[PDB]
């Protein structure tokens with residue numbers, strides 16, 4: 001239960017030249033985000049944001065179904081056991097902003113919530129060219145989000161309400177039972193070691209974003225976010241690598257850099273060759289392979 | 300773990316070939332009619348009937364031969380003379396030290412083109428020995444003389460062929476490791492860095508600890524079956540003469556035609572490594588924080604789609 005460092009009065013420069021390079025999670029207390037942290041009450045937020053349709057999600061596994069609703073009702077229901085309901089009386093809601101055409105364009109609080117945007121100052125921790133996306137994350141009290149990872153550097157700004165989040169090192173990948181970018185273990189707290197023995201060797205870092213706190217999540221770091229109370233956050237993705245290194249298709253910040261994806265493909269070719277020797281020689285030379293990859297491309 | 304390699308007597312060409320062989324495990328066979336070699340081949344006889352065919356030889360100043368440091372030097376001798384020296388302890392004449400040890404491993408006339416064959420190169424001697432007929436004729440790949448000074452310790456290597464190591468004279472301690480144990484052995488090519496296997500430097504080679512070793516000793520008359528890929532480490536305990544017979548377990552097509560020894564890995568496997576070295580080249584131009592993550596993705600993938 002390692003804790004992630006909290007730090008006050010950290011500077012633009014201090015961050016970029018001395019903290020950022022450490023490549024480790026870190027929360028930043030007392031940054032100036034503007035008025036937003038002060039005036040984004042459920043009652044204000046509904047008014048300002050508007051009634052544009054936002055794609056909704058309704059401990060989550062598919063035990064959730066997607067819906068849609070007017071932004072203003074999304075928030076108001078997020079706060080509320082909601083009276084009117086898509087599925088249940090004790091429904092829980094969850095927003096994750098997306099562009100107009102989700103497969104074409106990234107989310108961006110500027111373009112999509114202009115009026116609300118003017119209320120928040122994103123930390124100037126990266127260069128304006130490196131920007132990737134800005135995302136509203138509004139969830140209801142208690143919601144539990146599977147443990148995923150993102151390929152962009154991330155700033156998770158907690159604007160309103162509390163929120164627990166626990167993180168894992170990229171190197172605790174093996175113990176994570178990775179189905180793509182998500183991990184199989186839903187309940188982080190008391191995990192059925194029965195079903196997944198390895199999840200226990202994973203060193204977890206924990207921390208709790210209080211309204212106004214900023215959590216930095218380096219590229220590749222694993223993280224579970226549980227909304228202690230109701231609240232709205234925004235996180236900001238940005239390109240750590242030269243812009244050419246990433247996936248063009250990717251408007252979520254989830255697809256590996258092409259390089260990873262390319263070498264992962266030729267890897268499947270090497271295996272298609274190997275596969276034609278009797279299992280026993282195939283086994284042998286596969287292990288001889290991972291031996292190689294470890295000596296040379298590890299740390 | 301320290302296991303024993305089974306020792307079976309009166310095993311027949313059919314049992315071995317049908318029952319024992321497909322098990323793919325080490326096995327020693329006792330009491331096989333090896334021909335008269337086993338009683339005839341004294342050092343005096345071998346010098347004589349073996350002749351003066353000049354042979355390439357390993358000379359070493361220390362029992363524990365080493366490829367990392369390469370603490371031994373290639374030389375040549377007339378066969379008879381090699382035998383004669385291998386059987387002494389001290390030496391009148393010598394390449395390096397009065398106490399130096401010798402190792403013969405029979406080679407073809409032109410190693411670049413010719414596999415070694417006891418038949419072709421020591422015609423008179425092949426007369427005294429009846430190779431166990433335990434494989435199909437067509438798959439016979441090679442047959443090698445092995446002659447060593449007492450107390451000489453070769454290194455842990457594996458071979459790509461199946462192999463019958465025939466212990467004609469002297470006594471040989473042989474410990475083997477599974478091919479799955481590759482991860483514990485600190486290999487560099489078909490060789491292992493761990494030289495001292497009885498008193499291993501665990502400070503230097505920690506993983507060597509997880510390695511489960513089969514052990515067995517070879518006495519005159521004993522024949523040992525060493526399936527391909529099985530690591531093995533031999534130590535002639537007193538001066539002895541072995542011969543060994545490699546042969547193809549796979550479609551002859553699968554092997555590397557340029558290989559006259561039995562080391563070079565099946566072309567396909569070799570292929571996959573040139574391919575893989577390509578992936579490891581493209582990925583390599585990602586920052587290491589990243590590349591490292593995708594390496595570990597890669598091995599996770601191999602242990603699933605490609606391991607046993």
Ligand SMILES: O=C(O)CCC(=O)C(=O)O
Pocket residue numbers: 445446447453458462464533541543
């Ligand atoms: O007998 C020896 O000295 C070594 C034999 C060996 O390594 C083999 O037959 O593969």
Ligand code: NI
Pocket residue numbers: 148149150
């Ligand atoms: Ni995320």
Ligand code: NI
Pocket residue numbers: 456457458
């Ligand atoms: Ni060998």
